[PDB]
Design a binder for this molecule. Structure first.
Ligand code: FDA
Ligand code: NAD
Length: 272
């Protein structure tokens, strides 16, 4: 056989039950939901995401989230979601709609999932199928190495790709991750990230930057910049694919101009 698929139709919404919530850090959690049976798999190609939907305060709210589990996982899906709390930030008194709804869910509550979605699919052994837009067919890019620039929760699609590569011992793709967060305590999934480094150092290069660094710091500090991209992503001549995911200003000002500066062409770059 093959396992039963959860996301059988992309227009159907599937209500899934919350079964566990794990702290990632002060504002971020790992939400685990049960699939329709313990034998199901989600049905999500590597690189793709889902959407959650709920009527919040009387209005339908839809938001994408990027699972960090895979179709090898029977019976569950894991999401890693930053909660934007109310009554905290001076510019955002109300906080975030969906993220707080999720934070408020009790174990056994359901939320609607739909998918899969996204223009990139990792097909294994260095092959990426990337559509230029939703209305066009994919084109298949094989590379030997992948640069990854993530900011905050932009780690989630990167972790999906990294995990897929590392579990296949005949996948020789080398991933170079440059991960940016506001402070050291904001780093997400550090432990997990570090264990990948431990076990896969020939295939996985890891570097951090933080907007503000502690006195004890051995990594970079500040927004992603030209130097960091040279030093911590594969060079242009190696013809890598460069993946990027993070806040819109991060992409616009930190990533795009500096990728030009180093010489990574737009055709070998992809923003989630
Ligand atoms: C394709 C794709 C995939 C993903 C994601 C985006 C996209 C385009 N996201 C982001 C996610 O879809 C969603 O935008 C956020 O969860 C925020 O939605 P809310 O409804 O909570 O905030 P809402 O839409 O109400 O917006 C509020 C905004 O105000 C700001 N804000 C509010 N309170 C704040 C506070 N206390 N501190 C700082 N800023 C504050 C934030 O910028 C926040 O986004 C994500 N997210 C995630 O956590 N994990 C994931 O895997 C993904 N996956
Ligand atoms: N498209 C996708 O697939 C996808 C998936 C996951 C997350 N995301 C996005 O990633 C973002 C994660 O937000 P967050 O709250 O975790 O991030 P954050 O505000 O904590 O910022 C994380 C890092 O982004 C960089 N950044 C932020 N503002 C910048 C600026 N003005 N100039 C340069 N760099 C800047 C900094 O390096 C910073 O440490 C969200 O916008 C979310 O929608 C997108």
């Amino acid at each position: 056989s093959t396992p039963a698929i959860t996301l059988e139709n992309p227009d159907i919404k599937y209500p899934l039950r919350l079964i566990d919530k794990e702290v990632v850090n002060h504002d971020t959690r790992r939400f685990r939901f049960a699939l329709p049976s313990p034998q199901h798999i989600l049905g999500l190609p590597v690189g793709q995401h889902i959407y959650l939907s709920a009527r919040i305060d009387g209005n339908l709210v839809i938001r994408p989230y990027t699972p960090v589990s895979s179709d090898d996982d029977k019976g569950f899906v894991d999401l890693v979601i930053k909660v934007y709390f109310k009554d905290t930030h001076p510019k955002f008194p109300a906080g975030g709609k969906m993220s707080q709804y999720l934070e408020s869910m009790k174990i056994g509550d359901t939320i609607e999932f739909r998918g899969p979605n996204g223009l990139l699919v990792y097909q294994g052994k260095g092959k990426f199928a990337i559509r230029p837009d939703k209305k066009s067919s994919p084109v298949i890019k094989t590379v030997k190495s992948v640069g990854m620039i993530a900011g905050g929760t932009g780690i989630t699609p990167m972790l999906q790709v990294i995990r897929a590569i590392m579990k296949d011992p005949d996948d020789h793709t080398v991933c170079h991750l440059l991960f940016a967060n506001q402070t050291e305590k904001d780093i997400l999934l550090r432990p997990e990230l570090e264990e990948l480094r431990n076990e896969h150092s020939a295939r996985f290069k890891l570097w951090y930057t933080v907007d503000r660094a502690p006195e004890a710091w051995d990594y970079s500090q500040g927004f992603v910049n030209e130097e960091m991209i040279r030093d911590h992503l594969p060079p242009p001549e190696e013809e890598p694919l460069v993946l990027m995911c993070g806040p819109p200003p991060m992409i616009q000002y930190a990533c795009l101009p500096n990728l030009e500066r180093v010489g990574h062409p737009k055709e070998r770059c992809f923003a989630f």
